[PDB]
Structure formats: C-alpha cells, structure tokens
Design a protein around this ligand. Structure first.
Ligand SMILES: N=C(N)NC(=O)c1nc(-c2cc3ccccc3o2)c(N)nc1N
Length: 245
C-alpha cells in the first residue's frame, strides 16, 4: 500500500496473509486474501500460478505483522488450491484472476471467528457501488514502488471506484480492462495498491454492510498518474465462487 495508514487486523479481520515454503525451509510472503467462510479464503490466481502445489503454502488469519506472531492468530495448511481455469495474462493485465483456498489446521479445523478473525460478506450479483464510492484496500505490499522490503505492519488506504468508461480510455488502460474488472484510484494518484498487495480485499459499503467488491489484481506501477489499481470484479464471479465452495 502506497500512502494510507498503518492498521491492525481488528480493522480488517477477514484479511488473510498467505506465505510459501521454500526448499530448505525458508518461508516468504506471497499475497493477501479474504476469509469468506470459516474454511475458505479467496485470493488471486496469479499469486499461485508459478508454484501451484497446495502443500507449499501457509495461511494465517488474525495476523497484523508480516514476520512476527500476532496474539490470537491462527495458522493453516491449504487443503485445496482452486485456480480459475480461464486465467490468462498479457504483459500487464490478468484475466479471471481469482482463486480459492480451503484452509485446514494441523489438527483438522477451520477458522474460529474472534475479534481478530471474521468473514467478509460477498456482494449481490452484478451489484457494485456507483463510481466515486470510497472503498478500502488492505495489505502488506510495498510502501514505495522502489522499496526492496515489505512493511512489517499491515496497512490500509482508501481509493475511489472509477467508471469502466474512464478506465478504458487510451491513456489509462484501454481494452486491458474488461467488464470482469474494476478500477479504483486516488483523485491525486497519491495512494494505491502495489506489489505484494495482490489477492487482498477491496471492501465497500453496500446495502449497509462491508462487502468484498474487488480483489487486488494488477496495475502499471503504483500510485502513477492515469494508472489506477485494477481489481477482479467479485460480483461477476458469484457462480464460480458458489460452485467451488
Ligand atoms: N495498483 C497498482 N497500481 N498496481 C498494482 O496493484 C500492482 N503493482 C505491482 C507492481 C508495480 C510495480 C512497479 C515496479 C516494479 C514492480 C511492480 O509491481 C504488482 N506487482 N502487483 C500489483 N497488484
């Protein structure tokens, strides 16, 4: 997250932190995700497509820091790793960038909701907020495009939804943005998602409730003029989500 503010998991208690085990024991951060039911985390396919073996991954819930244990956190194995069969990528855009992880602890349990671990509601079908709606994004991604490190503390910021007409303008993204994507950005381009925020939630207030409207997917640079963040449009994937969960 470029800009924004530091936060703790209580503010975004559906946020999942996904890591990968390496040959030799080291563990590195991969991507974010969102808890949509006790046994299911939703994320982005591009986070896993290089290493699509579920045994490589660890999921934490209730975690506020990248490399420190947070009181109350829970740690899971990945029982199923479900990638979207119509995924594709060009030099910039990722299509159908959505993935499901079924989580299971070493003793065979799913998530126990708590003050630091909660599910996020899915949107109603083809129902998004109007353009200009403020939504929240959350993640452990880079604080500056040029940083080599990720922040140790979770961050969140606010971006505003951009109309599809505006985002497909040539000096934005053209046809790289599809109707299964949403764009969102800051009016001054000063705050944004970045590398390492992929897979995490874009949350908006819809019908009086916080709702998972988007999944961080891609963008050209970070917090660059005329280059919004692009998000998988969750309201267009409900049959896929329901069918694989
Ligand atoms: N909201 C945005 N503008 N961008 C992103 O959401 C986003 N940006 C990157 C990214 C930007 C970048 C710049 C220089 C080098 C590597 C970079 O990697 C990434 N790896 N994933 C993402 N989801």
């Amino acid at each position: 997250i470029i800009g924004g503010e530091f936060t703790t998991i209580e503010n975004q208690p559906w946020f999942a932190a996904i890591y990968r085990r390496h040959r030799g024991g080291s563990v590195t951060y991969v991507c974010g995700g969102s808890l949509i039911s006790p046994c299911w985390v939703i994320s982005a396919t591009h986070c896993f497509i290089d290493y699509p073996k579920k045994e490589d991954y660890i999921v934490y819930l209730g975690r506020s820091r990248l490399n420190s244990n947070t009181q109350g956190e829970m740690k899971f194995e990945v029982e199923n790793l479900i990638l979207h069969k119509d995924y594709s990528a060009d030099t910039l855009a990722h299509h159908n960038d959505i993935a499901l992880l079924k989580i299971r602890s070493k003793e065979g349990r799913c998530a126990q909701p708590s003050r630091t671990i909660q599910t996020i509601a899915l949107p109603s079908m083809y129902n998004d907020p109007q353009f200009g709606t403020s939504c929240e994004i959350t993640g452990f991604g880079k604080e500056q495009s040029t940083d080599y490190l990720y922040p140790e503390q979770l961050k969140m910021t606010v971006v505003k939804l951009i109309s599809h007409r505006e985002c497909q303008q040539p000096h934005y993204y053209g046809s790289e943005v599809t109707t299964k994507m949403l764009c969102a950005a800051d009016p001054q381009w000063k705050t944004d998602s970045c590398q390492g925020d992929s897979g995490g939630p874009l949350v908006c207030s819809l019908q009086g409730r916080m709702t998972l409207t988007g999944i961080v997917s891609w963008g050209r640079g970070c917090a660059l003029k005329d280059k919004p963040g692009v998000y998988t449009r969750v309201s267009h994937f409900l049959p896929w989500i329901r069918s694989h969960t």
